[PDB]
DNA sequence: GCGTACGTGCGTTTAAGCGGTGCTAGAGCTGCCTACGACCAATGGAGCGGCCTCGGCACCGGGATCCCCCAGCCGCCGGCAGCGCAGCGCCTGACGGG
């Protein structure tokens, strides 16, 4: 269900692990179930520390 | 280099701590009865294997942003150098005193 919504955003009809890793990581609750599992070819969540960004 | 706030110390003070009750709740165990899960023999069809064909995605090529950059550009202002000047203390007059 969470994965399917992600596939909608990228518009691909076929579900893909990149969706799966993305889906199960945004939900903080489901995150706790798999806090020590790594998905094949999952890729990290898109995140950047604010300080790294330019001052303005 | 600044400065505050947290360590050190002192002086209350109070609730922890001790020792003492007194209770019954609840855990531990036993006796005994039941049902429910394992076991066994059959059965078929759900699932798994083997093909096998379209199109979702990949890939390309092109056009479309769009942030990223920065000199242009001006405003601003303050510093700065020059200029006009305001005030004062002395300089020096006006006029009586020495």
From Swiss-Prot:
Modified residues (N6-(2-hydroxyisobutyryl)lysine): 11-12, 32, 55
Cross-link (Glycyl lysine isopeptide (Lys-Gly) (interchain with G-Cter in ubiquitin)) at residue(s): 56
Protein location: Nucleus; Chromosome
PTM-bearing positions, type N5-methylglutamine: 41
Transmembrane segments: none
N6-succinyllysine found at: 32
Subunit structure: The nucleosome is a histone octamer containing two molecules each of H2A, H2B, H3 and H4 assembled in one H3-H4 heterotetramer and two H2A-H2B heterodimers. The octamer wraps approximately 147 bp of DNA.
Protein name in the entry: Histone H2A type 1
Included stretch of the parent chain: 65 to 120 of 130
């Amino acid at each position: 269900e969470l994965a399917g919504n992600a596939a909608r955003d990228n518009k691909k009809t076929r579900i893909i692990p990149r969706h799966l890793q993305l889906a199960v990581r945004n939900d903080e609750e489901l995150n706790k179930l798999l806090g020590r599992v790594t998905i094949a070819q999952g890729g990290v969540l898109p995140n950047i520390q604010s300080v790294l960004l330019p001052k303005c």
